[PDB]
Every structure is written in C-alpha cells, then in structure tokens.
Amino acid sequence: VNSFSGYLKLTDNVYIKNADIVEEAKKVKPTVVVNAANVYLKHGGGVAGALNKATNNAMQVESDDYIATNGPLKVGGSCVLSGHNLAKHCLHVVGPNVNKGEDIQLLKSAYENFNQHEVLLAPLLSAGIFGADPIHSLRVCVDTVRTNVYLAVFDKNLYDKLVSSFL
Ligand SMILES: CN(Cc1ccccn1)c1ncnc2[nH]c3cc(F)ccc3c12
C-alpha cells in the first residue's frame, strides 16, 4: 500500500492521473520524482522548469555542480540527485527532444532508467516541449517500465485522450 491517490490503473504496474507533478510531489513526498531533464540539466521550462522553480532554484544549483564534475548526461540516460522539498530523490531522465532531431528510439532507453526504482512519480518522457507524441510515450512506458509508476499528466484534455485511446 502506498499514498498515491486518485489514479486510474492502466496495467499491473502503471497508473495515471490528471495532476500537476509539482503539487503531487509536494503532497505525496514520494521516494522518487522523475524530472524531464536535458543533458545539461538546464531546468528552464516544461516539467523541469516547474520542478526547479518549486525548489527555489536549489535543483539548478545542485545540477550545475553535478555537470561541472561529471559533464553532460547521455540522451536516454539519467542521474539521481536530491529531491529537495519535493521528494527524497529526483531521477533526472533525458528523453529524446524531437525539436532537436533526436532519435525517438532512445525513448525506450530513457524509460529503462525507471526500472532501477521500485516506485516513481513521473511525467510522460519526451512529451510537452520535448515534442514527442504523448500517446506513443505512454505506450513505450507501459511496454518498458516494470516497476510501479504513477504518471502525472498536467493537461486535462491530454489525459482524457490518453485514457480513452489506451489499448
Ligand atoms: C509534460 N508536462 C507538460 C505537458 C506539456 C504538453 C502536454 C502535456 N503536458 C507536465 N507533465 C506533468 N506535470 C507537469 N507540470 C508542469 C508544470 C509546468 F509549468 C509545465 C509543464 C508541466 C507538466
């Protein structure tokens, strides 16, 4: 039993809700919140900008030190950093950005990072300003993640479409 509330169950291990991931993170305090990161951990907009703003820029400060030490992530890769006031940990995952021409096949590799964590609160990778089709992202999620994932979808219209079109 966990504290996630109001989710629709899609499969054995995938759940979905219309929610603001920032507000869901602050209420749940999950062990892991997933950020929709880029390779530079520059949290300027989309989910990343919202999560970083909610940490009063502490996420960005920590991320800049991470990059100065380790260099950029790989597209499809991830790193674990602090969850600050939102979660125990933040798993920064880099899905391909279609608006940069990155290979959509890397979306599966991106979701594989979720399997290293038993339970996660996450957005749909490569959705929003990353330019992928969220229906495809949901399909890859369901077909790749085996651990328990709670997907927060900000846009109510999109959510209804994701639920209604799910196979
Ligand atoms: C993937 N996105 C955004 C998105 C874009 C297009 C269609 C659907 N969703 C999110 N997903 C879950 N929670 C979110 N909180 C957000 C707060 C923001 F200020 C900006 C973005 C998000 C956000």
The answer to whether 41 and 57 are in contact (CB under 8 A) is no
Ligand 1 touching residue 98 (CB < 6 A)? no
Task: State in Å: Cα 48 to ligand 1 middle.
Answer: 9
10 Å CB burial of residue 49 (0-12, 13-18, 19+) is: middle
Which of 87, 13, 12 has the alpha carbon at shortest distance from 55?
Answer: 87
Both tokens assigned to 116: 């290293």
Token pair 């959510």 is at which residue?
Answer: 159
Ligand 1 touching residue 112 (CB < 6 A)? no
Maximal C-alpha separation, the chain: 45
Asked if residue 1 is part of any domain, the answer here is no
Query: At what resolution in Å was this solved?
Result: 1.0
Asked if residue 83 is part of any domain, the answer here is yes
- What technique determined this structure? X-ray
Domain holding 60, by residue range, is 8-165
Residue nearest to atom 23 of ligand 1 (CA): 47
Paired residues of 76 in beta bridges: none
Asked if residue 63 is part of any domain, the answer here is yes
Query: What's the total number of domains in the chain?
Result: 1
Residue nearest to atom 7 of ligand 1 (CA): 128
Asked if residue 154 is part of any domain, the answer here is yes
101: left (phi over 0), alpha (psi -120 to 50) or beta: left
Ligand 1 touching residue 110 (CB < 6 A)? no
Asked if residue 128 is part of any domain, the answer here is yes
Paired residues of 14 in beta bridges: 149
**SS3 at position 5:** coil
Asked if residue 3 is part of any domain, the answer here is no
The CATH code of the domain that includes 87 is: 3.40.220.10
